[PDB]
Design a protein around this nucleic acid. Sequence first.
RNA 1: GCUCGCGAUGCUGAGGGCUCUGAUAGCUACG
RNA 2: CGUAGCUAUCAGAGCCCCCCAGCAUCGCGAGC
Lengths: 382, 436
Amino acid sequence: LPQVLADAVSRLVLGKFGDLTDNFSSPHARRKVLAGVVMTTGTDVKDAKVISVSTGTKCINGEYMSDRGLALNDCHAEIISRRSLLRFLYTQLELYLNNKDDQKRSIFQKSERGGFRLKENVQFHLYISTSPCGDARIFSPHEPILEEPADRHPNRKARGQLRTKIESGQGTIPVRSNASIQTWDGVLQGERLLTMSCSDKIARWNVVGIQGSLLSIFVEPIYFSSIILGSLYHGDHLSRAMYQRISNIEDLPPLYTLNKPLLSGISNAEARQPGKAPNFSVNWTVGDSAIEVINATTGKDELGRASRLCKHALYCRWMRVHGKVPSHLLRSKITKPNVYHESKLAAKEYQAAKARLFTAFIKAGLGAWVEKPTEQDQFSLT
Amino acid sequence: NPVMILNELRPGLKYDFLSESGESHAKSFVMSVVVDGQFFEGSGRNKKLAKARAAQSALAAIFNLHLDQTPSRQPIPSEGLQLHLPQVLADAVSRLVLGKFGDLTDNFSSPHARRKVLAGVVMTTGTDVKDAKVISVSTGTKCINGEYMSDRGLALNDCHAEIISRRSLLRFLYTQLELYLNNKDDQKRSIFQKSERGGFRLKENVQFHLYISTSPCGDARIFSPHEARGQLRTKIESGQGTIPVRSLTMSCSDKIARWNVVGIQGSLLSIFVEPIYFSSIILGSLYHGDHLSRAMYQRISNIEDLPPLYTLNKPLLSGISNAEARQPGKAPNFSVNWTVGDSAIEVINATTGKDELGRASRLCKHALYCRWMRVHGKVPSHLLRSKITKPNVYHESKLAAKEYQAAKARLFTAFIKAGLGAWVEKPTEQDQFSLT
RNA sequence: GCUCGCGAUGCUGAGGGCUCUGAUAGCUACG
RNA sequence: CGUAGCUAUCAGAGCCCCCCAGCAUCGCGAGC
Ligand SMILES: O=P(O)(O)O[C@H]1[C@@H](OP(=O)(O)O)[C@@H](OP(=O)(O)O)[C@@H](OP(=O)(O)O)[C@@H](OP(=O)(O)O)[C@H]1OP(=O)(O)O
Ligand SMILES: O=P(O)(O)O[C@H]1[C@@H](OP(=O)(O)O)[C@@H](OP(=O)(O)O)[C@@H](OP(=O)(O)O)[C@@H](OP(=O)(O)O)[C@H]1OP(=O)(O)O
Ligand SMILES: [Zn+2]
Ligand SMILES: [Zn+2]
């Protein structure tokens, strides 16, 4: 049943969080927002496993961008929990590639289309302890009211619109049709760094998948099968934000779709957390022994070291896998020089999903996507 | 970590809170201390860093220098390094410019004091830095919008501060030329003299130093200050920052590299004076020795076959002790300029290239030609460095500066040859006007 | 129904100042 | 063996200043 599934993953993610903070005692149990992914392999609750857990509510300061991929740009909890799912994807890949004995315990099989795909009946589920910023939270940032008045104004231009977190300022701000293009040059000088809101990033994952461009060179697209909120659930706002606002999307590459995961809140809504919001963010993937703590305003850990989630890390997980995947077993055969931005461009089909996405928002009056300065990915491991 | 050393090595000290400037976000506190007799000072966004800069100015003087945060903050020297030590010049230039922008705005009270980038040029007469003199002050970070571009040189294409500062330095240099030319006692005080090779040169050991509150946009700023392609970039008005050029207005970084080859005086002034180069480029923030140096000259060290007097100027590069702090937020639409001799600042809308009531700047193309024309009809035609008969149209009188246009084209190839893109010039019809 | 303007009451990441408490770290004083 | 005092740094609470540009609800005017 759907409501039992919701409360299940709600409890799973909490319990896993506690084990890592010794029953929420640890100094790093302090949070404003919790998130996590959970994997199911069958309808039995005994078949459900927590893949990752995370906290955080802030984004990097403009002047700490890393031109060599060493800083985390966006530490909103659910953004972080996807990045930790990505590590688990790279692990289950190196797992399959050890020998035929190990490869049975991987979640991937070989795909009858090229590259790899998940085995049947393995699904991932996203838990956020609050509604994702922008289109799904902005208009009702509050615990839903027993006596409804749902919206009242579903046709205002502001409904659906793409929106950004904005450096050192409140709100998630719609994309202006005047102001456009961010530059490395500029934000160092003082132009406040725009980051696309979390309701937007999750709508994107509902089209291009949760795996990213780099992993799509090995894997077929993957989707969240449910999205569960621990508090501040609003069925119409959420359904609008996660997909319905772009039901005008067309021409997606094969195996891409507009995914419509199950949406649901939980029975016992989580409680507001009192205090100043922590400026740090913790992350944990299945297979790690402890949590990692990142200063969100620096996108680095307390001693200035890069995270296991940063672009440079993930490039390196990606290369190790690249080096043992037979050129024939690739999903793309495009060759690009070994720099982060360029390897991404080798995922031609993913890049065209992306393009249809950006177009669906634009044609629907909902604004044009805001990207980071191109310099941000023009780094190499060499 | 610094004042801790000062107050554990002379532990009876107390600092006094002097002043505070600006408005709660562009606000800077100044903190002074007098340790072992002499009066130290530092500036900062918060009090604990202001007094940390003052305490470091104390530890460097009374004892010696601090933790040398890599070579990145360490100054690059020039060639024939006079005018005393680097950082002591840099701190003086910065103080002078910032102080004079004070006087120009009711000690920072005016609304026109609100700015993101501050720039200026100051002049020295060698030996002693107490002989310095601020030549020009300016602000701004926006360019003209295409809809407002002028066909008769009545609009300012580019109002990024550091560019506006150079246009003011021009105004200064026309002024000093006219000083020499209006009687024989007045040529006593002009900065120019007559040259061996024709026209005027500068009097031995007069130098100009360029200060910018931050690193110039484009190449010098493409790095992360909390841990290589010298390519050419263009501004993108519709915003701040730059885009690399593809295989529009040039980036400040590129324009200053240019001036590091063809000189700061432009074409029209070259007809009268030998090339003039900056001796220092001092940054009030975002200083990085390798990135600045590359942007400013290294990226085109493959330049060659320059006309006689031209060269690849390799000036002083230096940050400052009391660096400015990044203030995220909207950039102003206005640009302020002032040249020594002027009564007040002039205020430009950078999106219109004209001033607050729609008039032409003293810095726009038409204005500068007008002074150029007036000095031309004053100097004998045998004293000219480039013979230019019957000057009428702006673009042709520029072309008369034939040695300069050579240096321009050597520069343009030196960029292409290094794989750094091809310089973007504006449609030549914009300089097709006369004073008629 | 929506949009624009003016007003009102609220909602939701920065900077700075002054105090209360707690660890680390260095240096003093006293008995 | 203690306890006072003085600079530095990190974490938490309390107060005030300042900003930030969206969003809800309502009122008035106007348009589609
Ligand atoms: O938010 P994240 O989870 O880090 O996703 C980021 C990133 O977003 P942020 O810049 O907000 O972090 C990019 O977004 P843009 O800013 O460039 O839009 C990017 O997308 P690009 O493809 O444009 O780089 C890319 O996602 P993808 O895997 O589809 O490239 C990427 O993931 P990385 O952190 O791996 O760069
Ligand atoms: O505004 P500034 O940076 O002070 O320099 C400008 C101008 O630059 P913008 O057009 O970017 O305003 C021209 O540069 P181009 O676009 O044409 O390259 C021009 O160059 P040319 O006239 O040589 O094409 C010329 O420099 P110069 O006068 O030394 O030739 C000129 O100064 P003026 O505004 O005095 O013409
Ligand atoms: Zn968010
Ligand atoms: Zn500039």
